[PDB]
Amino acid sequence: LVHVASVEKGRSYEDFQKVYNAIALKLREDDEYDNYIGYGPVLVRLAWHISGTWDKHDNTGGSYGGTYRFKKEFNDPSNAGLQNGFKFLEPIHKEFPWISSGDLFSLGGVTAVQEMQGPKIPWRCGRVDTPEDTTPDNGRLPDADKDAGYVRTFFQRLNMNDREVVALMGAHALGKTHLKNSGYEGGGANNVFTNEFYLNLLNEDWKLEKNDANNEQWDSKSGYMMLPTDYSLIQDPKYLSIVKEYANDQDKFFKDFSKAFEKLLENGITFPKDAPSPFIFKTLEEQGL
Ligand code: HEM
Numbered sequence: 321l322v323h324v325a326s327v328e329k330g331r332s333y334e335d336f337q338k339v340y341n342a343i344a345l346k347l348r349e350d351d352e353y354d355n356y357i358g359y360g361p362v363l364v365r366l367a368w369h370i371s372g373t374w375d376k377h378d379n380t381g382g383s384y385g386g387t388y389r390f391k392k393e394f395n396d397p398s399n400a401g402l403q404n405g406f407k408f409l410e411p412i413h414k415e416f417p418w419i420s421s422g423d424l425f426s427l428g429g430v431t432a433v434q435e436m437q438g439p440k441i442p443w444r445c446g447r448v449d450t451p452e453d454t455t456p457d458n459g460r461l462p463d464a465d466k467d468a469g470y471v472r473t474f475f476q477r478l479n480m481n482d483r484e485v486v487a488l489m490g491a492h493a494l495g496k497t498h499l500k501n502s503g504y505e506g507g508g509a510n511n512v513f514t515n516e517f518y519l520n521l522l523n524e525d526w527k528l529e530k531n532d533a534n535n536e537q538w539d540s541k542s543g544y545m546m547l548p549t550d551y552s553l554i555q556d557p558k559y560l561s562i563v564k565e566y567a568n569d570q571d572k573f574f575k576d577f578s579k580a581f582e583k584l585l586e587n588g589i590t591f592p593k594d595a596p597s598p599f600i601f602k603t604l605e606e607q608g609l
């Protein structure tokens with residue numbers, strides 16, 4: 321399976337910056353969502369889940385086809401809660417009907433990260449909607465109740481190594497878990513992108529507890545929580561070294577996350593040699609907007 325990036329006809333950087341801006345302005349406007357967390361975290365999760373279906377072996381899944389728009393994927397139990405992100409993006413897609421679904425979902429994630437003061441994430445356009453029969457089956461997204469060995473093996477399917485996995489997981493600084501969504505509850509409720517995931521892992525006094533859904537999760541008195549898969553990053557000595565690195569170097573985390581997140585969003589896509597270079601969008605703040 322080959323998916324060649326095809327730039328939306330006649331579109332250039334300015335077009336996608338307009339879309340970025342519309343997303344960012346709405347992020348600013350709809351500030352009440354999820355007890356004032358806002359839509360930032362759920363948009364990042366959405367971009368990851370539409371990408372995380374990829375299988376390097378046969379190039380099925382991936383962000384390219386925008387298949388989350390189809391009920392099989394939309395209704396994946398692993399995607400519970402993401403409908404909020406999709407609804408957020410609906411009016412953006414109405415305003416810019418020319419953008420592909422894959423481009424919109426992935427751009428939503430990039431916009432969210434940047435607007436939440438995260439690293440710049442270069443982003444390339446050209447994903448093309450594919451038919452409903454190309455929607456990957458449920459069950460390609462990761463379980464949270466597993467250990468480091470599971471996480472490592474899982475991410476090999478997405479062609480991610482230890483450093484890429486540890487960097488990507490830093491997105492768990494964002495937002496919170498919702499019992500009704502995932503069977504996990506609580507967390508920092510933050511909407512600012514920092515390396516705090518790693519500092520929390522290393523610095524909090526974690527207690528393995530059972531939540532109201534009868535699932536185990538690690539909790540701190542400060543009110544933070546870690547999934548078993550999160551906590552596995554300090555149980556595995558190779559992961560632990562990287563956690564310590566990011567806990568002690570904000571810039572390095574930002575740079576590595578940016579690369580890994582772009583890679584994640586671009587897995588499965590062939591970019592022609594004469595495709596535009598990746599765009600780096602200005603934040604609203606950089607634009608004085
Ligand atoms: C082993 C890998 C992973 C597991 C098991 C996992 C699992 C979860 C679970 C269970 C939640 C709670 C969802 C809810 O109840 O609302 C969550 C939230 C979230 N995840 Fe992950 N995740 C993983 C990797 C990632 C990656 C790679 C990213 C992005 C790079 C990411 C981004 C997020 C974000 C931003 C949230 C907060 C969503 C919100 O606040 O609504 N996760 N994750």
Ligand SMILES: O=Cc1cnc2cc[nH]c2c1
Nearest residue numbers: 492495496507508544545
């Ligand atoms: O409190 C830390 C925290 C916040 N959000 C998430 C999401 C998954 N794991 C998390 C942990």
